[PDB]
Amino acid sequence: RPKILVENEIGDENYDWSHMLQIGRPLDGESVIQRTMYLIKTKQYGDMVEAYDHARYEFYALRMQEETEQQVALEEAEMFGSLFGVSAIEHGIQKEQEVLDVWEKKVVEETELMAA
Amino acid sequence: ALEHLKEGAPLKGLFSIEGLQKAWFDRVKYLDAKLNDCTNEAQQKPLETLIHENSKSASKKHIVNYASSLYNLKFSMSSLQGCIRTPPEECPRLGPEALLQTPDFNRTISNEPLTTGNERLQAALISSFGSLMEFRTLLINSNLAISGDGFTWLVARRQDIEYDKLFILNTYNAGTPFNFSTSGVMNELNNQYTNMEKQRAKQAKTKFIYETQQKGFSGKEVSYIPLLAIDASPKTWLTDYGVFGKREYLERVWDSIEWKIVESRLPQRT
Amino acid sequence: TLAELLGRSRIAQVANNHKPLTYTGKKFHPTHQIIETKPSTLYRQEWGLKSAIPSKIKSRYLVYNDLDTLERITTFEPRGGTQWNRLRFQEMGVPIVSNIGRQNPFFKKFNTEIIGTGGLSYSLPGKLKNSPNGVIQRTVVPGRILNLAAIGGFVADVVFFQSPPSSFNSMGDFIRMKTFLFEILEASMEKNGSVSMHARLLE
Amino acid sequence: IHVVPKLPNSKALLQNGVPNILSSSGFKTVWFDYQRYLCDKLTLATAGQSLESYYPFHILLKTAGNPLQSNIFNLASSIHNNHLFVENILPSAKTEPSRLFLSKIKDSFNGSDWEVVKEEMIYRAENEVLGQGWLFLVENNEKKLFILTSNNNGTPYYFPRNQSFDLNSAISIDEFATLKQMKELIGKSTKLNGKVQDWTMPIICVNLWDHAYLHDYGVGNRSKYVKNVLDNLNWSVVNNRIFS
Amino acid sequence: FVSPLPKDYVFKYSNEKLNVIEACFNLSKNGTIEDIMNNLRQYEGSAEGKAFAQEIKTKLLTKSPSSLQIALRLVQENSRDHIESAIKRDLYTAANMCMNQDSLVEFSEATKHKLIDKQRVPYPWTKKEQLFVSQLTSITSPKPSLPMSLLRNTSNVTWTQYPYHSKYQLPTEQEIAAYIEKRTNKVTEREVLNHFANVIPSRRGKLGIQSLCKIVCERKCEE
Amino acid sequence: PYPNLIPSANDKPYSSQELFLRQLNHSMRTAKLGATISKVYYPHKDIFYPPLPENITVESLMSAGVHLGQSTSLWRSSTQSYIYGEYKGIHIIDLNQTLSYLKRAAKVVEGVSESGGIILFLGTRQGQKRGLEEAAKKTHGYYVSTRWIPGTLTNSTEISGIWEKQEIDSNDNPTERALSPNETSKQVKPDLLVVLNPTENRNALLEAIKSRVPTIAIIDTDSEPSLVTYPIPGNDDSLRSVNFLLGVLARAGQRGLQNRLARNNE
């Protein structure tokens, strides 16, 4: 999952780690960890490990929800006559194809060299 | 049409005295009247049969859509029952904070089939989905995702009326949960288009892809026996729960499912 | 304090590792955190790291080990292929389930082993996927046969009814050129974190 | 982070709604709550991505070609479309439709009247979209205008994501042929992303979602609502978004 | 070495509270604590501001009356007069408090109650009436009975106002008002802020100066 | 506007140019529509809207990336006082210290601009040019991106001999009279050299201290801080942190210029 490291105003943010989903921040392992730290501070889970597990379990549900959202959005798009010119797998195949073509010509030349 | 709900006093769980009416009684009236306007016949008959008759037809399309809309709603409402939670008229409407709340579907479980009998149904669900909690997450999250006019369907894979395996699918606007009625219509249209072009390969490959998508592991086609429907449209939940309380609504619906009906719908296993 | 801010901040968030950027061994899952820029930030060479990154890099994504080294260069590689593999897998839509009879780990001192899947799929197995044409029973995916088949950023075991001679024996070790369709049956995940797919060749 | 824009005479709108078409509550439902919700969702989707910096319209244009991340597109489309609709609605920031606009209409619809065009639009709205959607009057690279319906979060701008008709229901032969032609055109594009050129601009967006009408007009009377909107809309805004 | 204030910072004394303070505590030549109390009682305006005024009247009541009166007597005189004389006066009144001949400043007992004995509970007081002006003067003035003198500085200097404070702190309302008057003889808020935040060389990088100026503008001037 | 636009016929569709204009019009009016995007970093905004020295915080400096010093193995121990601690195999610059030094630097920049001194912004790294030029424009000042030819101040007559000098008011009006050949040939020395990469141009610094010119520099955790009059501890490698510091300095100098113009007017 790509990570942007270019900071927006660090002073402007104000995250209540009662929950994971903050607005300016995305959902990631960081958010989990912040939640664990919050739990530790508040002493809901006195143990660190238990708090971590809890945060992980909160994350998982959110991730599953995110996963379902995208798939159903795709389904909807398919139903209502949306048209996607290049799918991700198709793109990948195309990318592989150029490399393979490059390899083939080179490989033939190498075989010829070996023969001679 | 239904017995369990009425115009004066709605369900204590889900809807309110006005909000229920907006959701159900008015919608049904709108649909039936529209259907009557479209077709000169006033005989209701079965809705499913009508859909089967008039499917794969652009001229006889609107009527089919209206039949689907009517049927789906009815199916959704049959499943539902009363609940323990307070009415939304008493409670406050959820604000922008509802979006940021973590869902408890992963960790918590409630209102299972086991609590009111329905043991074999529960076992079937478990077999399909791994667990009850996993099934619930699949259902509710899918329903949330629909974001527009649609329905989430618990279904059973028809190969006596035997079934192979339980499943769940979403269907939108006025889409049927039955596969056999609409299976291969797009392929047929493609074939017609190719014939027209000829009269006036890649296309063959696309047709082959369509065919393999459609056809099952053995049988010539496949169909789905619906067991549970859950509506996703703003029409129902905007009145009581506002904009932000879709998830809350779905939770309430889930709490107030009558699983006995679902179990009865579920046929014998192979 | 400053220290607290540093601990919070986006460089501290990237968990450190000194694994090879060039690893010619078997790659079963991502090694390094992929790091993207925006186009604007790329235009003025800023990635949110210690230093500017060379103007030769025109890709928005990269991977790194050290913010700064003794050689006065950040140790990086401009590639984020692992995200695309994940996205391909998602597109394919074959839900990973443990073939061993066990509960799904996402539901309910430290264990460093991979909790279920590594997070390439949080999809659940019970769903169907409808379309205009109908409910898709068989997932159709294009892939390449190597000799095993490369299917959308994953190598997968393959099976068929009869081994086709016309396609295979015409070009014995140039089978990689021709893309063939596949029917993906199921995806299991082993202890080492390898996704063991199983496909079926269509003709 | 994406936040809702401050409308002109906001306090007045909150007090009343919109004189003719939308109530105080009905306007809140369509904008002050729903738009906010949409913005929040979009922020959640695109918090740490490169998409955070871009405006909704530009996000939609970026995203349109990608099959995955359709949720982002949907949200971005909704946000833009809804604000266009609100802009069309607003009383001020009496104005008549422009002479140029009328001439363009006449050129387009076989020399018909503006009332006739409105009537055709409302008929299209009634017939085409089931459930949710949008009703646009657009203008393309050929200077003539035309009516464009979309089925939930379909954009008027980019024709592959017009989302103009439902294949969940049965479809015609002509519609299928049109789809096939579109697909062919898309394939002809020949770029890595695979995105065609398109210069469709919306002139009168209308919001056929239930977040606008359902409070005031009930589950029926969506047509009536659409008619009311057409009768009372900001014409100065429309005129501004017409000329090249 | 300064730093900006946090983004959650709010100036404790709100505008309405400042206005009610201005209304109540501003007094004439012969003002009293009783007069202030009466003013607080009869103030009318915002509900929150009225509640505040009531609260401050209550806390005045809780505190000692004679000491408050003495303070009131001192402060006008000190505002009028120069530093050294004011200091001397303060010293004299402290001496009088220590050695109360007239027995009209229950101080030592109150201190014992508070500082020595126990932190909790206020003192009940045994003296509550309006002291005369001559009596007040006698309390805050010297006599030939006891000799009094400050210890000599190296810089034995005397002045009516501070030589170096006005430069190196946030500018008073009075100074802002004077500037506005000068400008008049159009004017706007932004221009005033620029003048204060940029033109004045001593107060270019003052921390919360623009905000202060804005508050002043809100309180006093009009469009 | 657009005088050479040949508009297409009414029966015909839009031309390419006409279509482009229509797109531009749409962009200006209704593209940035659906939402507004608060709290997000645009790179350009630090150059064209830098904050005043007062309003800068430690948090803003951290976001800029000013805290990230060179490396643990590339440590000049001369810079020890400035560094906060080490983390991720990198020395991290104490940022309160950075702030105070920046303020001090900003004040001296403002002062020389007020006095009407020649400020010179020196920045040999790749991306720095545009922001450097902007800063030079902001105060009526000067810059160097293409390399500093050794001896611009020490050997001024040979190097900077054949370039045009000017005259200036108490304001900044050219007052174009002819400079005499004796009047032209004298050196015109800067009153503030401000560098963005002191480690890369040691020579310029050496020239400045020989030529008796006060100098400001972004001292990283490998740079010698004694080589300059007013060091600002910070991250000289990243382009955006440098720009932020530079932009601040420019803003400080701009203010002082404005004040000078005001007092001239008075």
Ligand SMILES: [Mg+2]
């Ligand atoms: Mg360096």
